[PDB]
Homo-oligomer: 345 residues x 4
């Protein structure tokens, strides 16, 4: 095919998703895959479900040469991304799926991630990859910071509403849920089937790394510092994510107004569907696809509204959006190789 792709950090779930998505992409082809501990091995050995594909042997990022690669997807650990990406050739279009380039405020990155920002200058040319919102800036960016999963489900509904002054920016409470696939493939006791199955629990209470990412996006639109309440919850399922958002509507605003604004803002958007009134979205319905379904409901408390937003955390919440961004960055149709329909049941 005419576009050659490099994947940095192919042994994780987001890496596997990239490979899955590109498999039937008409123009992009994976020609370089990097892995650390598994360098030298084929990917079938790491992920046997990919045996129908012919992929290159996994090599070290340090031994990788990009002279025949056109673009790169980075799925490396928080701790490596910044220095590796900084030392990457300039002729490369880069989409970083890590969180290391999402925050524009350096001090902010340091307080939330526990270490100095090691690519301060490069940071100022980075564009946040929330496709439907920053499409125009994304198309002309060289380095794109692909948003996190939760942040994606939150900003898509709230940005348009804040921009139109339809909701107040105080007391925005977000109670989110996610499938355990978002925790990664790391071999940890807490994520074993026996520990996760048949139960739920909150996590990242009060402080979760997605908080600053969420507030940055909302603050930019509200043109005022926005402080939200965000509480993640771990679901006994593989894929799927839902944010149940509790907001205060602006004076005189009704739920119908929020609905109309959303319907208008995303009417021609392939991946963002605004459901009719009273219709409840289900994570089951977007499972395995790059779609996001959202709906608005009145809150029993006068003046308040409830917004539900769902996606497949691994697709539109990660690798799907990453590809969505690379498509337009390379001048190809945005939906290219991203029209997979939900796998239900």
């Amino acid at each position: 095919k005419d576009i050659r792709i490099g994947l940095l950090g192919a042994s994780g779930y987001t890496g596997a998703e990239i490979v899955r998505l590109l498999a039937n992409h008409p123009h992009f082809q994976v020609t370089l895959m990097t892995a650390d501990r598994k360098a030298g091995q084929s990917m079938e050995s790491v992920f046997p479900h990919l045996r129908a594909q012919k992929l290159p042997t996994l090599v070290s990022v340090k031994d990788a040469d990009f002279s025949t690669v056109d673009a790169v997807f980075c799925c490396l650990p928080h701790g490596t991304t910044q220095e590796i990406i900084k030392e990457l050739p300039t002729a490369l279009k880069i989409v970083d799926l890590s969180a290391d380039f999402r925050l524009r405020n350096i001090a902010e990155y340091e307080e939330w991630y526990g270490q100095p920002h090691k690519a301060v200058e490069l940071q100022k040319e980075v564009v946040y990859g929330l496709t439907e919102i920053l499409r125009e800036d994304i198309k002309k960016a060289r380095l794109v910071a692909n948003p996190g999963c939760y942040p994606t489900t939150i900003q898509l509904p709230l940005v348009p509403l804040l921009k139109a002054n339809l909701i107040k920016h105080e007391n925005i409470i977000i109670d989110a849920k996610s499938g355990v696939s978002g925790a990664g493939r790391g071999a940890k006791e807490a994520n074993l089937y026996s520990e996760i199955a048949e139960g739920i629990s909150s996590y990242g209470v009060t402080r979760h790394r997605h908080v600053p990412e969420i507030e940055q996006g909302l603050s930019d639109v509200a043109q005022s510092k926005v402080t939200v309440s965000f509480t993640p919850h771990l679901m006994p399922m593989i894929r799927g994510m839902q944010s149940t958002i509790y907001v205060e509507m602006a004076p005189g605003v009704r739920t119908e107004d929020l609905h109309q604004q959303l319907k208008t803002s995303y009417e021609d958007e392939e991946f963002v569907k605004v459901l009719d009134e009273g219709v409840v979205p289900r994570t089951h319905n977007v499972r395995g696809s790059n779609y996001c379904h959202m709906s608005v409901f009145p809150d029993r408390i006068p003046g308040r509204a409830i917004i539900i937003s769902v996606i497949d955390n691994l697709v539109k919440g990660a690798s799907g959006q990453a590809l969505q961004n690379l498509n337009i960055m390379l001048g190809y149709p945005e939906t290219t190789g991203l029209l997979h329909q939900p796998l239900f049941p």
Copy 2:
């Protein structure tokens, strides 16, 4: 055994739970059981997992002789219970697990349940079965309305806090989650394994029948009408329930105060455990038991706090509490036959 128990509506999950719990209860014995379509059937037919027990043959409510039992557990649906219970013998101690006798305001019952209250008089002698809160009234009641599952997880933490004026009664937002067992054993498409598994969704948005029940309990304590926001969510799991409660602390009140009040209010309570600050409870940890674990956390938004409360929706959320109430109503130790430890993993 000393006490002969009658179970009205034994073919459902709450009925099965009653039978399971009483199996090793030293003093209560099931001697009479009612079923609708499955009347005349052996319960090994309806619930083969109960084959180790020697139980009675199921009969129809119309053919059951209630002078043959000492106490009764009612597990019929909402809107049937009132006329049946009203006609039950006066010498019977009754614990109704339905919602038909929970609301004291008649007009309120009618607007939320779609039909006139058919036992208006009897209603005034009914005591709400939230054991740890109304224990003293429950002991001397003849007819007890066993609370709903969600309401139980919400009132246990909030009542003590409202009583002590530690939290404001406005903008109490509740984002709850429940295993699908709470939906019952009814053969509906929406509850099939293929439709429920690997995904979540909200339900009963804006208006859910537990709302008035929740507000009634909170209003009584706050001595002012309390309006809450309550949003249920269906989890891809059998048992388990969690309410993530977002409240505004009263002026000058810190999370430490909420924690101390809860720790003090439930320090000698067997079934309600207050975890150490910062500790996240898990529904997995109370699964198959009558325990409720709760914890308090600071909200990122100044002045706000987060309360997590979990239980097994079928036990402390239903049949377990029902038995807890009958125990004291009959003069037996409250924890009798209710010390089953969580089944984890």
Copy 3:
């Protein structure tokens, strides 16, 4: 685009799968969909996960006109297909996913299905749709009987082995497992999440309708009547199927021989992968794809071997194979619109 497709019985899971698969098929387009119990209703109303697709309105079979379509997929309920298919125009290429046309012996169909065959004549022109085995006959057939799920996982491995006289045809024992999606979307108590989850059980012991289908295929190859032992098991999962096959090798034959024969028979086959000796296949690895992975192992009992064969019961076990057959029946590449990669995790 070029080919117009008619779907009879679109409200079930196999129907939904057909729609999902055709969504990105470059040449086939769904233009007609039958579903009487829900005729005049929108597909999104039945399966909301398909809302990204612009699909036709659901119509009654009676009110449907089939000279509008070039080919038809039949997903009707057993005992309803024969008469309907018998009356279809003859310029229609048909792939029946039901079991009504799989058995060539009429008396056999009657004893196993409880009713007379109502299309005896048409039956003799029907070709069994096990693509990799009867490809050549399938290409020139007008009416194809798409095989059942279990039978597909069994015949693919055994046919080549029997043809090469590498295994005896007596005492072939098959212990199969399947996700509950194979039970359909029918609203039955036994298939509720609460009844299925966290446990397994056998079903169709001794006699299961797939038995005659399995034996027919094996008997044809062995040129002798083959009697097998086949025991289905219901798995607490949506998709996935595995047959663990216990066979007796022929005199002098070793497991290496079975492996080589299979490797040779399917070396150029896209959808049938023979793993390296000793490698254990996983249903997780073919989930959501049209692939079948099989492997051979020595049995501890001398002279015996163990064969594991897995597929996604809804794809290669049903709708995926159906499309695979229609592709070649219409002269298009066999793999057209069937290269979806496994959705793992």
Copy 4:
């Protein structure tokens, strides 16, 4: 309480099960627990679900004083058990849940476990803990080797049948399934929720450590060396185990005979239930209890029969049987503290 219990290796699932079971045991009380790696910590820190119990603080084996307890349950790692038990004081009744003392043939233990038997002498005084079969020997034993999970489900049905010469001892094929809890709490990639959920796979094909254990028990009864075929399968569920056993009936025998023999052999047994012919047992039905349900069915292949045997792998398959054995070893009623009814749903 009367008896003081010591638990060696309390940080694993079998250890947690022991603690759960003893919680309501009227005469046994845990007074010593060993968890080396996590020594000094609280049991609550390891298994927060046990917070309702007041347990002693975790200790190290090298720091435990065994003269303080009357009996011990050993859930230590394989290979660390023989030497530790060999040094335990003579006054202790010991039930080892590991597999290190199950095999009587030393050479056999070495070939299957990869290391020399380090307690050869002690081995000859060990009694296999399959309660219903060796009850009389168990009562007077000091050291009991608690059987493995799979072996328990297999021997209970087969021993009586072999003893009565109702089935041949050749070609006994066992296709077993187990919930992932049997794999332990070890933090391994393969057992993560994302890797296990929604799929199945075989494991321990051809050679699995339970093989020699299974054959030893069967060989002793058949008074001839028995060679079986045993294939384990990993189920996407926590608890539960089923063995589907394919056997050849002896000349002149019918399935009715196998059923009668089993019904007679276990008619007065609390924990082993023989279902009526044709009734299919479900692992769901014994979940969380110490019960075993079995049923016999005719095989389609003349002369063959099918036996299904299920248990909760963690209870009757491990800790439940361990306690069952200790009860009688100490002179207490066998069912003491083991009458927990199945937790269904």
